[PDB]
Amino acid sequence: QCVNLTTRTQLPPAYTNSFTRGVYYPDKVFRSSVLHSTQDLFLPFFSNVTWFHAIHVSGTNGTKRFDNPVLPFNDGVYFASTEKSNIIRGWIFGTTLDSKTQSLLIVNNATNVVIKVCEFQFCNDPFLGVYYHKNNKSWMESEFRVYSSANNCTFEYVSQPFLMDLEGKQGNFKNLREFVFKNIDGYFKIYSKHTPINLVRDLPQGFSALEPLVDLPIGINITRFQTLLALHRSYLTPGDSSSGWTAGAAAYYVGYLQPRTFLLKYNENGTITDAVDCALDPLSETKCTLKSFTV
Amino acid sequence: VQPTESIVRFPNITNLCPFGEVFNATRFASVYAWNRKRISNCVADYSVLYNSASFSTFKCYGVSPTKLNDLCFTNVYADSFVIRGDEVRQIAPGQTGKIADYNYKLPDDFTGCVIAWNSNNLDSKVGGNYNYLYRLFRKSNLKPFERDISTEIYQAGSTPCNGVEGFNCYFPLQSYGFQPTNGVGYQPYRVVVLSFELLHAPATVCGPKKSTNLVKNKCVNFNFNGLTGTGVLTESNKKFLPFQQFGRDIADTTDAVRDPQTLEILDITPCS
Amino acid sequence: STIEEQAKTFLDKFNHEAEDLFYQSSLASWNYNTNITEENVQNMNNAGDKWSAFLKEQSTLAQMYPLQEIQNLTVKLQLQALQQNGSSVLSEDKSKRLNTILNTMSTIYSTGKVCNPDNPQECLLLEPGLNEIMANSLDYNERLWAWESWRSEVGKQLRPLYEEYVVLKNEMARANHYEDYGDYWRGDYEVNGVDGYDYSRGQLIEDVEHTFEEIKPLYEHLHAYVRAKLMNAYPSYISPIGCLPAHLLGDMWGRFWTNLYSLTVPFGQKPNIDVTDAMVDQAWDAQRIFKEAEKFFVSVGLPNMTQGFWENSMLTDPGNVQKAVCHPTAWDLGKGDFRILMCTKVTMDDFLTAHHEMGHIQYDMAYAAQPFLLRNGANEGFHEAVGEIMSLSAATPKHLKSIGLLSPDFQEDNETEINFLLKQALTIVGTLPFTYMLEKWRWMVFKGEIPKDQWMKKWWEMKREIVGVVEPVPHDETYCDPASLFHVSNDYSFIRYYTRTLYQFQFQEALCQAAKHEGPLHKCDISNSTEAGQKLFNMLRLGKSEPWTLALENVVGAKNMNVRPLLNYFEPLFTWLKDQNKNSFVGWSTDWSPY
C-alpha cells in the first residue's frame, strides 16, 4: 500500500507572518460587550509561521513541490489552508505513528469525515489522490495509501455520507479553512472556521474567531502531526505508481501556540470581533492594564 | 426567600448502547472462543437489565447493581458465551473447576456483573445440538481474561504426539450435547460477563440521568449539566451562539443558562 | 507425568464421551417402551450396539493402565469397573456358542408350552395360564399336573444346555483371574484397599449362613402355622410332621407365599386396610398419586421432582392408540432427565408402587452428583431397598389417615395388625429360605462340590433340610428342576433379594429410632422428620464412590449385615405364632416323600 513519491523539487523553507489570526473561543460562555480577558493558549500576533507550497509548472523548469513533513506538536498547532479545490483532506496525529502506539486519523475520503483512533502503520508519504478519466469523464476519488493495517481500534466516528466537489478549477483561491488543534486534558479540541478569499500571494490579513467544532475524548498523547494532501492522476503525465503525478493550487500554514494573555472583545450578540496580544508591545501592555481599546 | 425545589436537568438520552444487540444476539460463540465486544461510547442503562426478571444469576462484584447508573467508565467489555447450567457457578472470582481455569477465568478482583439465563428454547434441538464446544485439556491454567484458540492435540504421556491421537494424545476441544429433554443443570445457559475498567482517559460511558420537572417562576435550586446555584428562571431574550451553553455577565457571574433539552435561553435572578 | 494423572485424564475423557451415548441409548429405549413399533426397536438396537461397541473400545485403552500403581481410591474403583474383561477372555467359537446357548435358553423359557394331553389346543405361553392355576386354585390334581408339566416340558429340555452353560461360565471365570463363576457373582460385595472396611469375598457365605441360622426359628414357626392351616384345606394330603409339598405353595416355584393369605388368614372376619374404594369416591388419579408421593418425599427432606419429570413421564396408559409395556420402571437417562414409566391405576398397590419408583428416582438424583462409572447403588440390594422402605412407611394406617384416605375415626385393632404382619411375613420371609437354598445350590454347582450327577438329588435334599418343601413326584437325574425359574434361565443373580430383605429392615429401624418414634416398628412412619431424611441422604450420596460397609455404618451404625431388625419387626407376629403353635408340632422332618 505504501508508495513513495519521487521526482520532487526541493526548496528552502519559506516563512510568512500571521498578522492577527488563531483567536478562538476559549470557553462556551456567552458575553455581550464585556471585553473579557483570558489566560490560555493562543497564537501570538504577527508571529512566524511556516509556508508549504504545492505547485507544478509545465515544461522542464519551474517547481514540482509536494510537502507534507512530520511537523512537531508543541501545545497545539494552527492549521490554515488556502485551497482552490479539495486537496487538503485530513491530518495525522500521534507520537510514534506506527504499531507501537495509537494515532488519531481524521481524514476525508470524498465521502465524509472519518475519525478513527487505532494503531496504524503510516507510510513515509501518505496521500489520497484523485482520478480524472476520459470515459465517464468526472473527477473521482479512487486512491487510499495512508496506512497499511488498522488493529486495536478504540474510537471511531463516521458521519453521514456526502458528495465531494473534486473539480480542479484553475485561477485564484476561493476559500480559507482555519483549524486550531489542542489536547490538554485528553479531550481533542478542534476549532474550525470558513472564510472566502481571493488572493494568490500569502495568508489573508484580518480577523476571524474560530468556533469549536468537535471535542473528541481520546486521551492519547500527541507530539508530532502530519498533513494529508491529494494527487491528480490523469493523461499527459505518464509514470509508475511513484511517478506520473501532478498537483497545484495548494498551500497550508502551520503556527504553534504558546501560553499568552489576550483581551478578547465581544459584540452585542456574542461574536469575537477584535483582540490584542498583551505581550507584543508596551502599547498593548497598557491596553491590557487599563482593559480598554481607547488609549 | 429560601429555596426549596429541584429542577436538575440534563440533555436527551440518545444512542443508548448496543446492549440490545449483545444480549438478544441470535448466535452465540463457544466458551473457548468467547466474543469480546467493546462498549465504550454509549449511555449504558443498567436499570433495564437489572429490572428485567428474566435472568437467573445476576451477581455484580465490586459494585452494587443499584449504583451502576451512578458511575462513569471508559470501556466496557461484554464476553458472550454458552455454558452448561451446573457450571454457571464457576464463572465467578476465586472459583475453580474445569471451565474456569481452562476456558475462561475471572481475576481475584472483579468490577462487573455476570448475567446468565436459561436458553433451552432456542439453543436446543431434538437429536442433539453439537455446535457448542468447550476446552477440556490444557498443560497450564489460564490467565485472567485470556482466550486460547489453539487446537493442538493434548499430550498426557511421555510419548510425543505426532499430530494424531494415540495412547495419551487426546483432542483438546470437546462438544456439548444439548437435547430439549435434558433437566436443569445440563441445559444451555447464555452467560454474558461485563467488565468495568478505569484508566487515564476521559470517561465515555456514564449513568443515564434523564431530567426533572422545570420550574420557571419560583426560587429553585437548578443543575444544568454540572452547573448549580439558586434563583428564578425567567425567560430571557439573549440569543446565544450555537455552541455557547451558559453566559456570564460582568464580574464573572453566572446569569444565563441554556436548557439542554429544549435549547431555550433563560435568565437567572437571585432570590429575594 | 505419572500413571495417576494419565488415568484421571482418560477417566475425564471417558466420562464426557459416554454420557451422551448412554443418554441416546436410554432415550431410544424409552421411545421403544412407550411406543411399540417396528422403527423404534430398530433405533433401540442401533443405540444399544453403538453403546456396546463404545464400551468395548474403551476397555483395551483402559486395560493398559495398571492398577497396582494407583493411590487414589476413586480412580482405582472406576478403572476396576471399566477394565472388566467379562466375556472377552474366551475364543470366538466359545463365545459364540455361549451366546447361542444363553439365547436359546431364554427363548425356551419365554415361549413355554402347556399342551394338555388329549387336547390338540390350549397350549398357552407364559401369559395367563399355569400362573393363575397354581395361584388361585384349590385342586390337588390340577396343581400337581401343572407343576409336573412345566418341570418336564420346559424342564429337562434345558439339562444339557445348562450343563454347557455352567461349563462355559466356569471357564470364563477361571480365565478372568477369578475362582468359579460363583466367586464372580459374589465379587459385587467385595471391598479391598480400605482399612477396617475391607470385606472378603468368601465372608459373604458365612454372613448369609449366620443370618439364616437366626431366621430359622421365625421361619419354622411360620412353616408350622402354614402347614396347620393347610391341613384344614387339604385333608389327607400333608402330614403334621412332614414337609409341605411343592405345588401347594401358591406358586409354580414356591418363591412367594402371597397366594396363601386367603387360606391362612387368622381373623377372616376382620377386613384389611385396603383404601381402594376410598380413592374412587373422590377426585383421584395418577397425577394425584404422584403428587402425594412427592409430598411424602419432601416431608422427609428430599428435594422436589424435576420439571421434566412431570412433562416427560407416562403416568397414565395412553390406551389402544399406541402399545406400551405397563411394567413400572424408574428411568435414569443420565443427563438430569428422570422419569417413570408406569400405567398407574387408582388402586392401592399402584399407590405403593408409585412410592417405590419415586424412591428409586430419589436415589438416582442423589447419586447423580458423581462420575458416570459410580452413578449406581453401592450393592445390588440398596437400590431396591430404598424404595421398599418407602413403600413400607407409606402403607401404614397413620400416613393413610394423615393424607385423607382412611377415616380419622378408624380404630387400630390388633387383629388387623396381626393380619398385616402375617401378609408381610408371607411376602417377605417366605422367600428368604428359598433364595438362600437356590443361591447356595448355584454356588455349589459352580464351585464343583456337586458333580455333573446328583444335581436334583442334592437340590431336593437341601429343599427338604433348609426349606420345608418336599417334591410330590420323584424326579430322577434326568429332569432339570432348578432351571424352571426366570433368573436361573437368564443368568441373573439371586442373593440380591436376600440382601435387600436384610437391608430394608435395618434401614427402617435406623430411620425410625432417629425420628424418636415409640412403639412397635411395623407402624413407624418416616414423615415430617428431617433428621431421618438427612441421615438417609448422607448414605444416598455415596453410591459406588465409597464401600457399602461405610454406607451401612453411616446410615445405620454397623459394618455387617444384621438380622436383628427383622426379628424386631416380626416380634408381634412371632409371639402370636408361638402362642398358636402350642398344641401343634413345630418344625419339620424328612423321610416323608409322598410317593
Ligand SMILES: *[C@@H]1O[C@H](CO)[C@@H](O[C@@H]2O[C@H](CO)[C@@H](O)[C@H](O)[C@H]2NC(C)=O)[C@H](O)[C@H]1NC(C)=O
Ligand atoms: C519507499 O517506500 C518504502 C516503504 O514503502 C520506504 O522504505 C523505508 O526507507 C527508510 C529510509 O528512507 C527506512 O528507514 C525504512 O526502514 C524503510 N522501510 C522499510 C519497510 O524497509 C521509503 O519510503 C522508500 N524507500 C526507498 C528505498 O525508496
Ligand SMILES: *[C@@H]1O[C@H](CO)[C@@H](O[C@@H]2O[C@H](CO)[C@@H](O)[C@H](O)[C@H]2NC(C)=O)[C@H](O)[C@H]1NC(C)=O
Ligand atoms: C470512505 O470511508 C468510509 C469509512 O471507511 C467508507 O464507508 C464504509 O464503506 C464500506 C463500503 O463502501 C461499508 O461496508 C462500510 O459500512 C462503510 N462504513 C460505515 C461506517 O458506514 C466509505 O465507503 C469511503 N468512501 C470512499 C469513496 O472511499
Ligand SMILES: *[C@@H]1O[C@H](CO)[C@@H](O[C@@H]2O[C@H](CO)[C@@H](O)[C@H](O)[C@H]2NC(C)=O)[C@H](O)[C@H]1NC(C)=O
Ligand atoms: C430483547 O427483546 C425483548 C423483547 O423484544 C426486550 O424486552 C422488551 O424490553 C422493552 C424495554 O424495557 C420493554 O418495553 C418491552 O415490553 C419488552 N418486551 C418483552 C416481550 O418483554 C428486551 O429488552 C431485549 N433485550 C435488550 C437487552 O434490550
Ligand SMILES: *[C@@H]1O[C@H](CO)[C@@H](O[C@@H]2O[C@H](CO)[C@@H](O)[C@H](O)[C@H]2NC(C)=O)[C@H](O)[C@H]1NC(C)=O
Ligand atoms: C429532546 O427531546 C425533546 C422531547 O422529544 C425534544 O422536544 C421536541 O422537539 C421537537 C422539535 O423541536 C418538537 O416538534 C416536539 O414537540 C418536542 N417535544 C417535546 C416533548 O418537547 C427536543 O427537541 C430534543 N432535543 C434535542 C437536542 O434532541
Ligand SMILES: *[C@@H]1O[C@H](CO)[C@@H](O[C@@H]2O[C@H](CO)[C@@H](O)[C@H](O)[C@H]2NC(C)=O)[C@H](O)[C@H]1NC(C)=O
Ligand atoms: C482422588 O482424586 C479426586 C479428584 O481430584 C479427589 O477429589 C478432590 O477432593 C478434594 C477434597 O475433598 C476436593 O477439594 C476436590 O475438589 C476434589 N476434586 C475434584 C475434581 O472434585 C480425591 O480427593 C482424590 N482422592 C484421594 C487423594 O485420596
Ligand SMILES: *[C@@H]1O[C@H](CO)[C@@H](O[C@@H]2O[C@H](CO)[C@@H](O)[C@H](O)[C@H]2NC(C)=O)[C@H](O)[C@H]1NC(C)=O
Ligand atoms: C405432617 O405435618 C403436616 C403439617 O403440620 C400435617 O398436615 C396437617 O395435618 C393436620 C391433621 O389433619 C391438619 O389439621 C392440618 O391442616 C395439616 N396442615 C397442612 C399444612 O397440611 C401432616 O398431617 C403431618 N403428617 C404426619 C404423618 O404427621
Ligand SMILES: *[C@@H]1O[C@H](CO)[C@@H](O)[C@H](O)[C@H]1NC(C)=O
Ligand atoms: C522567521 O524565521 C526564519 C528562520 O530563521 C527567519 O529567517 C525569518 O526572518 C523569521 N521571520 C520573522 C518575521 O521573524
Ligand SMILES: *[C@@H]1O[C@H](CO)[C@@H](O)[C@H](O)[C@H]1NC(C)=O
Ligand atoms: C468508467 O468509470 C470507471 C471507474 O469506475 C473506469 O474504470 C472506466 O474506465 C470508465 N469508463 C468506462 C467505459 O467504463
Ligand SMILES: *[C@@H]1O[C@H](CO)[C@@H](O)[C@H](O)[C@H]1NC(C)=O
Ligand atoms: C489496545 O491498546 C490499549 C491502549 O492502552 C491497550 O490497553 C490494549 O491492551 C490494547 N489491546 C490489544 C488487543 O492490543
Ligand SMILES: *[C@@H]1O[C@H](CO)[C@@H](O)[C@H](O)[C@H]1NC(C)=O
Ligand atoms: C504522553 O501521554 C501518555 C498518556 O497515556 C503518557 O503515558 C506519556 O508519558 C506521555 N508522554 C510524555 C513524553 O510525557
Ligand SMILES: *[C@@H]1O[C@H](CO)[C@@H](O)[C@H](O)[C@H]1NC(C)=O
Ligand atoms: C446582532 O443581532 C441582531 C439581531 O439578530 C442583528 O440585527 C445585528 O445585525 C447583529 N449584529 C452583529 C454585529 O452581528
Ligand SMILES: *[C@@H]1O[C@H](CO)[C@@H](O)[C@H](O)[C@H]1NC(C)=O
Ligand atoms: C408412536 O409411533 C407411531 C408410529 O408411526 C407414530 O405415528 C406416533 O406418533 C408415535 N407416538 C408418539 C407419541 O410420538
Ligand SMILES: *[C@@H]1O[C@H](CO)[C@@H](O)[C@H](O)[C@H]1NC(C)=O
Ligand atoms: C483382560 O484380558 C487381557 C488379555 O485378553 C489381559 O491382558 C488382562 O490382564 C485382562 N484383565 C483382567 C483379567 O482384569
Ligand SMILES: *[C@@H]1O[C@H](CO)[C@@H](O)[C@H](O)[C@H]1NC(C)=O
Ligand atoms: C417444592 O414444591 C412446593 C410446591 O410446589 C414448593 O412450595 C416448594 O418451595 C418446593 N421446594 C423447593 C426446594 O423449591
Ligand SMILES: *[C@@H]1O[C@H](CO)[C@@H](O)[C@H](O)[C@H]1NC(C)=O
Ligand atoms: C387384642 O387386644 C385385646 C384387648 O384386650 C386382647 O384381649 C386380645 O388378646 C389381643 N389380641 C392379640 C392377638 O394380642
